[PDB]
Amino acid sequence: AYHIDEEVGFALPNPQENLPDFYNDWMFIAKHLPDLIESGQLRERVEKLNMLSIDHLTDHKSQRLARLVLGCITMAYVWGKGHGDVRKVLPRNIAVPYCQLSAALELPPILVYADCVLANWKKKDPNKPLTYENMDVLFSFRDGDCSKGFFLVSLLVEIAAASAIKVIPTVFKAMQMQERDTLLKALLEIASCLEKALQVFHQIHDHVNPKAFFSVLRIYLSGWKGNPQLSDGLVYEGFWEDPKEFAGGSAGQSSVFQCFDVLLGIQQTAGGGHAAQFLQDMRRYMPPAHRNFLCSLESNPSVREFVLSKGDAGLREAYDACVKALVSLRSYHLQIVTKYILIPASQGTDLMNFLKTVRSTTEKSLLK
Numbered sequence: 001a002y003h004i005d006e007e008v009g010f011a012l013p014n015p016q017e018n019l020p021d022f023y024n025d026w027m028f029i030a031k032h033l034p035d036l037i038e039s040g041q042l043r044e045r046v047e048k049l050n051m052l053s054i055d056h057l058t059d060h061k062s063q064r065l066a067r068l069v070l071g072c073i074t075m076a077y078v079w080g081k082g083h084g085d086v087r088k089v090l091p092r093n094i095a096v097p098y099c100q101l102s103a104a105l106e107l108p109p110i111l112v113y114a115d116c117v118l119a120n121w122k123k124k125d126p127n128k129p130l131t132y133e134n135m136d137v138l139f140s141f142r143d144g145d146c147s148k149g150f151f152l153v154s155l156l157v158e159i160a161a162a163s164a165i166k167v168i169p170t171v172f173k174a175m176q177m178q179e180r181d182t183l184l185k186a187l188l189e190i191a192s193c194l195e196k197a198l199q200v201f202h203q204i205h206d207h208v209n210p211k212a213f214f215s216v217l218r219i220y221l222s223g224w225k226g227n228p229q230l231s232d233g234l235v236y237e238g239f240w241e242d243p244k245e246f247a248g249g250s251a252g253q254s255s256v257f258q259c260f261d262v263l264l265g266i267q268q269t270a271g272g273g274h275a276a277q278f279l280q281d282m283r284r285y286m287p288p289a290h291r292n293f294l295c296s297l298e299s300n301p302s303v304r305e306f307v308l309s310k311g312d313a314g315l316r317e318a319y320d321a322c323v324k325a326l327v328s329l330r331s332y333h334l335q336i337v338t339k340y341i342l343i344p345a346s347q348g349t350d351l352m353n354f355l356k357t358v359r360s361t362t363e364k365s366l367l368k
């Protein structure tokens with residue numbers, strides 16, 4: 001459908017772990033990034049790769065794994081050890097298959113949230129639940145980069161949100177069939193699930209320390225759009241002649257908040273303002289099925305107008321409960337950003353303005 005899973009939502013269910021043997025040379029590099037970056041063999045190993053056709057990647061899962069593999073390699077190749085020694089040309093033997101794969105998957109040829117979070121995970125025991133203790137990531141960049149903590153916690157927020165995402169059909173079916181009580185129950189379940197997601201968000205502190213995130217992991221997630229270190233973007237050698245700019249991987253590429261924004265008729269993409277066009281641009285970095293889901297939601301009849309049109313205090317309360325959960329999420333998120341980015345940096349104003357603009361736009365949608 002829209003590739004939304006009942007259990008893990010926008011996350012990729014049961015991600016593939018191994019590529020065909022044909023790609024062993026890719027997988028070896030991706031699996032040893034900490035060693036290869038530290039020693040400085042990473043770039044040589046990439047430059048020594050044979051050109052591997054993407055023709056042996058024939059299903060969505062192996063394609064997604066391949067994207068994850070090539071994306072991590074590309075971040076490691078471009079940024080190296082992360083202290084200004086960058087590469088402006090991605091060698092053809094990575095760039096061509098990476099760009100061809102990206103075109104088939106309709107994603108930009110850069111590491112994105114849907115790679116390093118949504119597809120970058122495994123259960124330790126398939127017969128145990130989705131808890132941090134029973135989960136791991138598939139790839140990290142450096143020892144101590146907190147990639148396991150940051151990726152898995154993001155993933156757990158996605159999984160928590162899946163419980164709210166799966167009731168969205170009930171919301172639109174209830175409006176259609178004029179089932180006031182069903183609609184009211186649905187909105188209350190969404191708010192309650194979004195509240196649960198806020199509590200999962202607290203696990204960031206349990207598994208990410210700010211020093212490692214800001215000074216290590218953030219480097220490998222950085223992109224080449226408006227980046228002075230790559231002012232023209234990256235050359236994808238043998239695929240496009242001129243360099244192209246793409247933003248880096250970020251939980252800001254998640255579909256979770258945008259999903260409930262559009263659900264509730266919060267028009268975050270309205271206007272020419274910088275917050276709107278950023279959130280619009282981020283959609284290009286989401287899997288196409290999830291882009292299409294967001295667009296289908298915007299085309300559905302408005303939940304907000306339905307609620308505003310019925311003189312029904314219980315419905316307005318349920319709806320506001322959803323808006324307030326979103327506001328609460330964004331408020332907590334501002335704290336996280338302060339802790340993981342603002343303080344480590346000063347030891348910027350645009351970033352906090354952007355986030356406050358989005359929370360305020362959410363807050364304005366309150367009926368009370």
Ligand code: HEM
Nearest residue numbers: 153154157158204250251252254257330336337340341358
């Ligand atoms: C250490 C933890 C985190 C940090 C430092 C962080 C950082 C940021 C930053 C810098 C932005 C601005 C947009 C950008 O530069 O890409 C952003 C926006 C955003 N982030 Fe986070 N993030 C963290 C965790 C999360 C998690 C776990 C989620 C959701 C699963 C998330 C969801 C979002 C969303 C949806 C936006 C878009 C703004 C909005 O809708 O309010 N973030 N984040």
